[PDB]
Amino acid sequence: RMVDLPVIQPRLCTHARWPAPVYGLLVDPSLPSNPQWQNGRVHVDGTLLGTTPISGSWVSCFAAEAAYEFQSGTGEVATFTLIEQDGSAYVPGDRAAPLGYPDFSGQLEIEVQTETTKTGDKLKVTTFEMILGPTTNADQAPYQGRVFASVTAAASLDLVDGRVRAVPRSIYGFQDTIPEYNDGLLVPLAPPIGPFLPGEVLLRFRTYMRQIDTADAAAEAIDCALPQEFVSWFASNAFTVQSEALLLRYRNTLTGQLLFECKLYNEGYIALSYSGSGPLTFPTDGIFEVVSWVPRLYQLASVG
Amino acid sequence: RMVDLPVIQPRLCTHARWPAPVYGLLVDPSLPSNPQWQNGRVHVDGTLLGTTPISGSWVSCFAAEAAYEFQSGTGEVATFTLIEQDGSAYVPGDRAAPLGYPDFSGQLEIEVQTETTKTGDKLKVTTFEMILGPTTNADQAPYQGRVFASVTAAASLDLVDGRVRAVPRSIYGFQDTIPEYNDGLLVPLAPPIGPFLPGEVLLRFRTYMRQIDTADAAAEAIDCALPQEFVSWFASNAFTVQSEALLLRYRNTLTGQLLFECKLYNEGYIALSYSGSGPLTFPTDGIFEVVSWVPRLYQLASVGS
Amino acid sequence: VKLLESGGGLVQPGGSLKLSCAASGFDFSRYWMSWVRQAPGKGLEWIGQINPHSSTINYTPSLRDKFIISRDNAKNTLYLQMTKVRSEDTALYYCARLLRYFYALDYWGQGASVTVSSAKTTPPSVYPLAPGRAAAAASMVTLGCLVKGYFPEPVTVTWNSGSLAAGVHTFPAVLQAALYTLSSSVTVPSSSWPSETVTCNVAHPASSTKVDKKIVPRAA
Amino acid sequence: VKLLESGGGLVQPGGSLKLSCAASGFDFSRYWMSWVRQAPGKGLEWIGQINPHSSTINYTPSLRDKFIISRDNAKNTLYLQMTKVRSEDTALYYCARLLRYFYALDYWGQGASVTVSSAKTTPPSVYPLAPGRAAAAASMVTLGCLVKGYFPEPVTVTWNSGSLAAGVHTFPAVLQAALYTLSSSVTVPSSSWPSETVTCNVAHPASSTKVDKKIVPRAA
Amino acid sequence: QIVLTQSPAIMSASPGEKVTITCSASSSVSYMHWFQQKPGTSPKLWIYSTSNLASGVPARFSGSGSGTSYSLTISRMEAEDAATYYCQQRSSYPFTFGGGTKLEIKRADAAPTVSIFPPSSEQLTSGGASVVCFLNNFYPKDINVKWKIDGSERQNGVLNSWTDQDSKDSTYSMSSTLTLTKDEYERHNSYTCEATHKTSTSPIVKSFNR
Amino acid sequence: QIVLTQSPAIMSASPGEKVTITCSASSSVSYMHWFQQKPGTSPKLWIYSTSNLASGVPARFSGSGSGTSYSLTISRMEAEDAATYYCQQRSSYPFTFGGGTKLEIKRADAAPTVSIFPPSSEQLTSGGASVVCFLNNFYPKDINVKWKIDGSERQNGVLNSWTDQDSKDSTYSMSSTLTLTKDEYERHNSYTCEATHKTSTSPIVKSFNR
Secondary structure, three states: OOOOOOOOOHHHOOOOOOOOOOOEEEEOOOOOOOOOOOOOOOOOOOOOOOOOOOOOOOOOOEEEEEEOOOOOOOOOOEEEOOEOOOOOOOOOOOOOOOOOOOOOEOEOOEEEEEOOOOOOOOOOEEOEEEEOOOOOOOOOEOOOOEEEEEEOOOOOOOOOOEEEEEEEOOEOOOEOOOOOOOOOOOOOOOOOOOOOOOOOEOOEEEEEOOEOEOOEOOOOEEOOOOOHHHHHHHHHHOOOOOOOOOEEOEEOOOOOOEEEOOEEOOOOOEEEOEOOOOOEEOOOOOEOOEEEOOOOOOOOOOEO | OOOOOOOOOHHHOOOOOOOOOOOEEEEOOOOOOOOOOOOOOOOOOOOOOOOOOOOOOOOOOEEEEEEOOOOOOOOOOOEOOOEOOOOOOOOOOOOOOOOOOOOOEOOOOEEEEEOOOOOOOOOOEEOEEOOOOOOOOOOOEOOOOEOOOEEOOOOOOOOOOEEEEEEEOOOOOOEOOOOOOOOOOOOOOOOOOOOOOOOOOOEEEEEEEEEEEOOEEEEEEEEOOOOHHHHHHHHHHOOOOOOOEEEEOOEOOOOOOEOOOOEEEOOOEEOOOOOOOOOEEOOOOOEOOEEEEEOOOOOOOOOOO | OEEEOOOOOEEOOOOEEEEEEEEEOOOOOOOOEEEEEEOOOOOEEEEEEEOOOOOOEEEOOOOOOOEEEEEEOOOOEEEEEEEOOOOOOOEEEEEEOOOOOOOOOOOOOOOEEEEEOOOOOEOOEEEEOOOOOOOOOOOOEEEOEEEEEEEOOOOEEEEOOOOOOOOEEEOOOEEOOOOEEEOEEEEEOHHHOOOOOOEEEEEEOOOOEEEEEEOOOOOO | OEEEOOOOOEEOOOOEEEEEEEEEOOOOOOOOEEEEEEOOOOOEEEEEEEOOOOOOEEEOOOOOOOEEEEEEOOOOEEEEEEEOOOOOOOEEEEEEOOOOOOOOOOOOOOOEEEEEOOOOOEOOEEEEOOOOOOOOOOOOEEEOEEEEEEEOOOOEEEEOOOOOOOOEEEOOOEEOOOOEEEOEEEEEOHHHOOOOOOEEEEEEOOOOEEEEEEOOOOOO | OOOEEEEOOEEEEOOOOOOEEEEEEOOOOOOOEEEEEOOOOOOOEEEEOOOEEOOOOOOOEEEEEOOOEEEEEEOOOOOOOOOEEEEEEOOOOOOEEOOOEEEEEOOOOEOOOOEEEOOOHHHHHHOEOOEEEEOOOOEOOOEEEEOEOOOOEOOOOEEEOOOOOOOOOOOOOOOEEEOOEHHHHOOOOOEOOEEEEOOOOOOEOOOEOO | OOOEEEEOOEEEEOOOOOOEEEEEEOOOOOOOEEEEEOOOOOOOEEEEOOOEEOOOOOOOEEEEEOOOEEEEEEOOOOOOOOOEEEEEEOOOOOOEEOOOEEEEEOOOOEOOOOEEEOOOHHHHHHOEOOEEEEOOOOEOOOEEEEOEOOOOEOOOOEEEOOOOOOOOOOOOOOOEEEOOEHHHHOOOOOEOOEEEEOOOOOOEOOOEOO
16 A cells, blocks of 8 residues: 555666666766657556557557558658557547557557458558657647658558557667647647755666668667556556655665665655766666655755 | 456457457367467466566567678578577576577567667667578577577678667468477477366467468467466466465356356466367457366356356 | 659660659659650550668569669769660650659659650751642642651741741651651631642751751642 | 689670589588789779578679679589679689688689670781891891781780790780780890701690791891 | 440530540549540640549539549530540559540531542652542541442552541541552552541542543 | 888898898887788788788798887798788788788799791781790890891880799799781891890800791
8 A cells, every 4th residue: 555666687677768667777967858759658646648558569659550652742652540559449538549559759650450350351551750759740640640751762562551659660860859749729738847945856767779871870769757567657656745745766786885865855856966967877776665655845855 | 355357348458469459358179279389478476487577568579689691591691699688698497498489380570679778879770581481501599699680582682799688570471380499309398288178279369460471460369377467467466376266257247147167277377278170269348257266176167158 | 743754766676775864943852753654555554763861772573684673862863774675665764752651653754755766867848839720619728738757756837937827737756677657737718828838848857957948839 | 622714705885694604523502702803004993792502692782783693513513693884894713612600712723814795706817027237246136027906815825836935925914905015025145046957836725726837037 | 453444435526515435444543534635735734533634724614423434524525625534543453544535526518629639740750650639627527438430349459547526616627648660650540539427318529530 | 101112122041051131110019920921812811910920831930029119030041932022011001011022033044945936827817016026044034135127126016924933943934925917027027036034144045037
C-alpha cells in the first residue's frame, strides 16, 4: 500500500520515446529546462497523462489505412487515416494523437507493412518518409486523423495498401520540440514540467537514435522523464499518494555507497539539485530506494 | 502480500519470443504439446529460468564483437563473439546462451549496427544472415560464445566491426524446435512444459512473424507461454506461493460474463481444458482476475465447443 | 514536365544506335521510366521498363538481347541502345514517365523516328501539275505540285510560305523499294488564276534543298 | 575458383569491343568484381568496380564515358564494353574477384590482350642465321633463326618441337610502326653440328602459318 | 503472355449518339487502361483501372466491365472524339497493347471532283509517263478509282495515297499516279481514271485524249 | 585522387641479405597492399592491411610502416624472390597502384661472347642489309653495343632487344640488328658491333670484313 519501485538496474530498462534500451544517465543545467513532452508520462497515482501507451512496442508506431491519389504535385505521396493499433477505430478526444505517436520535430523514415490477420496471408513492405516538424507545406494534422507520408527513392512498383502498421527506423534533422499536432490550432496537451525550486535540475534518462545525413550516419541523443518499466508498473499498481513529493536515494549495489538524493515528485519526474555548469553523468548500475514522503518545499542536499 | 495480475487487456501487451504485440489467443491439441521453450519463462516465485531477459527490447537481440578472416566458407562469413547486451563480458554458466537469444531453428536475418556510446559518433549498418537449425560444416556454437553469420548479396564494401548489436527482422523456413545450442553436446536448459492431466491443452498467446520465401512474403504464427508484462511484473514483485495452482477467471470487460477457467500453475503457464478436434480461438479484450489458490488436480470447468 | 529525344536518323542493318530521351521539369531521379514503340500503321508495343536505381530492369521476352536500357541521374537523361538492328525494327520510339501504384504510363515525350536504310539521301525531282483540261465546264481549278523521288521523310510543302489555306491538300508519302512520293492539291477560282499565280514551296530539311515551283498553264 | 576471358583481338580506332570474363567454381552472384589493366611496361591501373545487384558502379574519374561494365548472374559471366576506342588504350585486361571487408583484390583471371591496329595480319618472312664465322677459335657455335616481318603477337618458336633445352634463347618482340621482329639463339658444340642438324620451328597462330627452318652452314 | 483483341477495328457515328468499344481478353485479367492518339501526336492517358478519368478529360466518357471483357462507351459523341483508342493491361506478364480501333465522324455523303494532269514538259523530258488522278471531298472511305487505259484495267504501277477526315468539313480526299515510262505513252494518246463510288452506279469520269 | 611513388625503381641484392622497399604517399592514407608478378603471369596478392601474409607465402617477408610511409622488407633473399612488386591503397578515392619496383639476383659479373651474322642468301635476295649482333650471359644490365661502321657510329636503324635474368645462371643476354637496304651494303665490305661494358676499358669486338 506504500509505494515501491522496480528493483532493476536502469541499464536494464526499455525507453519511452524511442524503442531502444537506455545507455546514459545525466543531469543538465544548460539544455531547455522546461520540456513539454507527451510520451512517457504518468502520475504516480496511476493515470496516463499525454499520449503514453502501455506496451513498449507501441511507441512511435501508428496503424492506419493506406490510399493514394495523383494530383500532387509534391511527388508520389500517400494519405493515411489513423486508427488505434489494437484494431478499434479512432475517434478524436482529448489526447492530441492516437496512443503511441511520435512527438519530436524532424523527418522520420518509417517502415510499413501489411497488418497481419491470420496464418498464410501475403505481406508487402515499403519504406515511406514522413515530415512532422513545423513545416506547413502539406497539411499535417493527426488530430483529425490525416497524415501525408511520401515515398522514398524505393523499389517495388507494387506499393502497399489496406490496413498497415508503421514502425520508425531513422531520423533526419532532429529537433526536440513538439510537432504541429493540429494544423495551427490548439489541442489538449499535457502541461509542461514545472515548477522547480531554486537550484533545480531534472533527471534525464538518455538514449541514442541514428541521425542520417549525406551518405553517412551519426548518433544523436534524445531524453525522456522515466523509463518504460515505471510507466507499466505505476499504470498497473495504482497506489495512493500522501502529500506532494517522495524522497529517494540512488544506492549502488556492489558496495552500498550513495550517489545522490533525488526527489520523486508527484507529477511524474525525479528532480535533483546540482549547481555546476557543464553536464555530469552518473553510473548505470545503481538501484533506487523509496524512503519517505515529505513536503514539496523540502530543502535539498547539494551534490557536486 | 496476496498475489495479483496486471489489469491489462491481452491485446495491449508485448510478446516473449519476437518483438511484436499479441494478436490472437487460441488453444490447440493438434500441435506439439511438449514445447521446451526458453525465452519468456518465469517462476511466479520470482526467478528467471532459461534465457528470459528483463526488458521487452532484449528479445532475440545479441551484442557481439566483429572480426573477419578469408580462408574458407566461403560466404565471406563474419565471426562474432558474444557479450551481454549491457556491456559486461560473458562467461558460460547455467543458461545455454547470453541473455535474450533466439530459440527457434531456421534461418534468421539479423540487422547489425555499431554500438553507440556518445553523441557525434559514426555508425555503420549491414544485414547478415545466419543459420540456427541442425546444419553442419558451419558449426554454430553460442554456448562457447562463437557464432558464424554469412553476408547477403547486397550493400557492402564497408562492413561493420567493433561493438555491434543484432536485432532480427525476418525468418526463412521456420521450424519451431530448439537450435543446436552447443555444437551437439549438452547444455543446462530449462525443463519441458508440463506435466499434464487428461483434459489438458496449454494456452498459447500467438503473434505473427514475417516469413520470407521465393519472392513473396507470408505471415507465420509463433507462440509463447506468457506476455512480457507478466515477466516484468513477477520478476519485480517476488510473491510467495502456497501449493501449485492458482485458479483464474478470464472475465470480459463490458458485460461481466465468463469465457473459461484457467489453472495458472506455479511453474509459469496457464493450462486449460478443451476436448475438441480442431483449433479454437477466444476474444482478446477481456481481463484476467485472481480468485483462489487450490491444489494441482482441482477439477476443471470445461469450456468446450 | 516536358521531354525530348535525339538520335533519330538513318542506320544500316546490323548497325547500332543510341537514342537519348531527355527530361525537364520534375524530379527525374525518383520515377520509373519506360519505352514503347509504334510501327507505322500497327498498334502500340511495349519494350520494357527501368527503375531509378537500375536495380531491376524488365524486358519483353523476345528481342531482349538487342536492347540495352539505362539512364543517368546526374546529367538527368535516359539512354536506349540498339545493337545489331534489323530492317523490321523501324518505328517511332516514345519514352513514358510511368507511375507508381496504378501503372499508368502518363506523360509521353514527342517522338523518335528510326528508319533503317541502304541508299543515301537524294533530293526530290519536283515537277508541276500541268492542268490538262479541255472543252469542259470546270469553273474552278484544283491543281498543284508533284514531288517525287526523294529520301528520306519528311518534307514541308506549302504555298506562299504558310500563308494560304484556301482548300489545300497534302497527301502523305509512300515508298516502293526506291524512294518517296507525294502530291499536292489546292482549289482556286477561275478569277484568281492565271491572274494571281500561286507558288509550290518544297522543303527538304536533311539535304537542305529548299526550292519552289511557280507554275503556268501549259499550251498543249 | 578459375576464371577466363574472351574477346581479345584487333580493333580499329573509334571502334568498340565486348570483353567477356567468365568464372567458375564459386557463388559468382555474391561477390563484387573489378577490372584492372596493365599497359606493356608501365605499372597497374584501376578501371572500376561493380557490385552484384548492379546497383552502384564506381568508375575512375577519367575515361568513364568510354567504358560500360555489366554482368549476368544467369549465364554466370561478366561483360566489359569499350566504345570509341583510341590507340593509347591497348593493354592487358584482368578481372579480379574483389573481397568484402578488406578490399583486397585476391583472385585474378588469366589475361585479355587488346591491341588497336590498322593493317591486317601478315605472315613472317622467316630467315635463317647464316654463321659468318672465319679464322677464329670458337669451338662451340651459338646460332639460330631470325623471324621478321609479322603481325600480330604472339609466335611460338622452338627447336625439334619442344624437345630441346640445351641453351635456347628467345628474345621478345618489338615493333617500329610496321610489324614485329624476333631472334633466336641456341648453343651447340662443334661435335653436334653439322653432324646432327637442328630445326627452327616457327608458329604463327592467327594466320595459322606453321613453318620450319632447317639450316645449313653457308659457303660464303 | 496475354494477347488482346479490339473490336470493331473501325467504326463511326454522328454527334449525340452513344457508341461502345469492346477490348476482349484471351485470359483472366484484372485491369485495363485506355489511350487516345490523335494523328501526329504522342498518345495520352485516358482511363486507368477500367473506371477512372485522367487529368483533363471531359466527363462524357465511361469505363466499365469486369472479368474477361471490358468496354469503353461515350454518352454523346462530338467533333473532338476522333482518334485511335488503345487498350493496355497491366495484369501479370510482359504488358500488351490491343490492336486499337478508330472512331470518326459520320457525315452525309458527297461526290468527287475528278482531276487529271498529263505529264508536263519537266515530266516529258524526265523520261516516263508521270500521270496522276486527283479526287476531293467525298464520303465515305469505300471507293475505287480505275485508270481506264483505253478501256482496260492496268493494275500495275498504281500508287495511291488517301488522306484523313478533315475537321472543317469532315470528308475524305484521295490521290494517285502511275509509275511508267514512255513505252505506252507513245503507243496511244488517250487515258482515263474511272472513279467508282457508292454514290451511284454511274462512275464519274474525266477522260483525256490530248 | 592520391598518387603514390615507389623507390627505388630497380634494385638488386644477393641471397642472405636484407632489403627494404619504400612506397611513399602524397597524402594521408591508412592501408596498403602488395602484389608480386613474376614475368608472364597474373599478379598475386601478397600483403594486405600493411601487416598480414597472404595464402601461401613463405614467412620471410615483413610489412610495416604507418602514417604516410610504408615499406616491405625481407629477412634473407632467395632465388624465388625476383619479380616486380606493386603497392595499392584502398583508402578513400579511386584506387591507385604505385609505379612498381623490381628486385632481382646479384651475381658476379661475366663477359659477352659476341657473334655476327652477315645477310644470308635469303636475306641477300630480300633486298636489304639484315645484319645482326648477338651477345650472351654477361652481367650487369648496364652495357652498350655500337656498330662500328668502318669506325663510325650509326645511331639509325638500331633495333635492340634485351632479355631477363635467367634462373639457371642468373645472368642477362642481348641481341640487336640493323634495318637498312643495300645502299651502304654495296658501299663497303666491312662492319663491326663494338661491345662496351663495365668489365674493362677494353671493348670486346668481332669485326667482319668478308
